[PDB]
From a paper:
[name] belongs to the solute carrier family 15 (SLC15), also known as the proton-coupled [name] (POT) family, which consists of four members in eukaryotes: [name] ([name]), [name] (SLC15A2), PhT1 (SLC15A4), and PhT2 (SLC15A3). [name] and [name] are best characterized and mediate the uptake, distribution, and resorption of di- and tripeptides in the body. [name] and [name] are secondary active transporters, which are energized by the inward-directed electrochemical proton gradient. On a structural level, human [name] ([name]) is 708 and human [name] (HsPepT2) is 729 amino acids long. Both polypeptides consist of a core transporter unit of predicted 12 transmembrane helices (TMs) of the major facilitator superfamily (MFS) fold and an extracellular immunoglobulin-like domain (ECD) placed between TM9 and TM10.
In a first step, the structure of [name] was investigated in its apo form, while HsPepT2 was preincubated with one of its natural substrates. In the outward open state of apo [name], the central substrate binding cavity of the transporter unit is widely exposed to solute molecules from the extracellular space with an opening of approximately 30 Å. So far, among the available POT structures, no outward-facing conformation has been observed. This previously not captured state allowed us to observe the major structural changes occurring between outward- and inward-facing conformations. In [name], the large bending of TM2 is stabilized by a hydrogen bond between Y64 (TM2) and N630 (TM11) in the extracellular region of the transporter unit. The sealing of the cytosolic side is stabilized by two interbundle salt bridges between R159 (TM5)–E604 (TM10) and R161 (TM5)–D341 (TM8). (A) In the first step of the transport cycle, the transporter is in an outward-facing open state stabilized by two salt bridges between R159-E604 and R161-D341. Concerning the [name] structure, 11 residues at the N terminus, four loops connecting TM1-TM2 (residue 49), TM3-TM4 (residues 109 to 116), TM5-TM6 (residues 189 to 194), and TM11-TM12 (residues 638 to 641), and the last 25 residues at the C terminus could not be modeled because of poor density likely caused by intrinsic dynamics and partial disorder.
Residue numbers in the entry: 12 to 48, 50 to 108, 117 to 188, 195 to 683
Amino acid sequence: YPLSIFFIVVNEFCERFSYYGMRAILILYFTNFISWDNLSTAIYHTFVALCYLTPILGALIADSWLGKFKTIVSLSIVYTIGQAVTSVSSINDLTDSLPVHVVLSLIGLALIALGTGGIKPCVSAFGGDQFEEGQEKQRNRFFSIFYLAINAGSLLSTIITPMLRVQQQACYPLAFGVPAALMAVALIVFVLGSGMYKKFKPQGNIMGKVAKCIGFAIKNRFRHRSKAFPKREHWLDWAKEKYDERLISQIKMVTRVMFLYIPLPMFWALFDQQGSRWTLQATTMSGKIGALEIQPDQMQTVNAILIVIMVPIFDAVLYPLIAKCGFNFTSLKKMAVGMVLASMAFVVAAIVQVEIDKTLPVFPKGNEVQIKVLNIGNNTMNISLPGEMVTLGPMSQTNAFMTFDVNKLTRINISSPGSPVTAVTDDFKQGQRHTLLVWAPNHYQVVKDGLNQKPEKGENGIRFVNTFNELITITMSGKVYANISSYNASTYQFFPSGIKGFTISSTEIPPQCQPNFNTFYLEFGSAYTYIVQRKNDSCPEVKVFEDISANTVNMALQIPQYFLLTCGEVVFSVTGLEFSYSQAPSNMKSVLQAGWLLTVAVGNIIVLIVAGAGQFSKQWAEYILFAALLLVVCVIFAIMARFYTYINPAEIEAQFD
């Protein structure tokens, strides 16, 4: 048997790597039409439907018309041809009949749409078929190894993909060639193993027979409106009138198994919510391990890193250990446990989020308006605010922003010891942090900050304030602040972590002065304001003040929730697909796998429909999103599964004819 399984494993590995490393370049290239076209949105939304519908259109072809082997071969051939046509056409579109080549490229995309889906159920069913005579242990081993191989391909695509771009903007030839070459290699290596495989062909158009039988049965059931109309069994009482009992039993088994999958799409949609939330939580969790400098958005790879190790470990040790203590640990129990663990992952996440909430600042809401005062003069200033008065020495700042309401922010007065009083005439906008600058009794400035949230991706924001008489221009690590007027401040520009250097340029500064300066270690999530001041010899000098404190909590704290989520995903998915194959009848192994994939498709549709989030508070959002939905789904699924859906040994039940 191993000779018949190694080829399948390598083919799956290569195909998955190709698809994952191909999708990103696909979207990058199709962005040409997305922008060139809101007409493009309609096309995309109907196109994704083809990708979500191809699985059934492949399974139906495989089981009834051509068989699994022929379907795999043909679908792989067309998929490779699609990649090849996309690769060749993309060259003309970027070098140069342009609409013709664009149409050929779109036809290639459509062809790939078929291939991406046509292989998923058929290959799994073909792999499962190879085991016989009570080798269920080896079958489970194979299924676990197959699931591991899929994630290994995904991880390799994730790690390799970044190297590709702009390695040669016209690097598309390699981009669309390498996946095609790898898919061709996979197809050839799979085909060369034909001699050892085991294959079957259908007796006929089973799907058409099933459709006709179902129609006749439901019509007959709707007959006899006043003669034993209540069913003894929904189809045994009526379909039996004309059709063979074997087909009746097969459809009965398929319907019975499929009944269990009704709740699963909701679970999938709920589970998918973590992707766009935990990354942001990482953004606000930019604390760093002392050893290395992982970026906030790189945490997502931990899922694959954990799965590719968890999958072997369970089958290797855990299940034998659970069996030794005699727990009789069956499939339905495994799936329920997996979903429960998935639920617990989110409660751990909620605990971490509420722990984080301690050290974040508070930003204005609604009509609230916030102000920070910064004295940049040579002397002390006294400033009167609504219901408060503050004294600031030279080159000094208020520790934190003062919060007021737009209606109540009516009077502001500035004065210095023995100096005249100046009233503020500027206007403050609601929901915006404002910086107030004072350097003299009758000289001040109001600056809109713009920053009302933690910087995206944990980057550090920097801005400069000019105190020189003439304009100044600042360049720092590939970015430039140009033409800053006297006693004015520029907008924030975001930079990644690490130390950075910058140069100061201005006509007022004599050329012989020191041009360059360096900043301290910026860490993550922080924002700082720099003030440039004139020395005795006209040289510039730099001083720093803080605006938002650097982030505190270490980023390693996300590991527990990710570990729980990965365990729940594995122990659920592997057992789910194994059970799906196990209970399917002989004539329809592929259809039920296609139904399993449709289960994920429907969850994807549900998550897309719900779309943007609107929960009032993150702590409650992370909390309910399991405590009120996931456990309810789990209890519903357990109640449904309580009715002996596992009673059927599909392999031998049909022997009674």
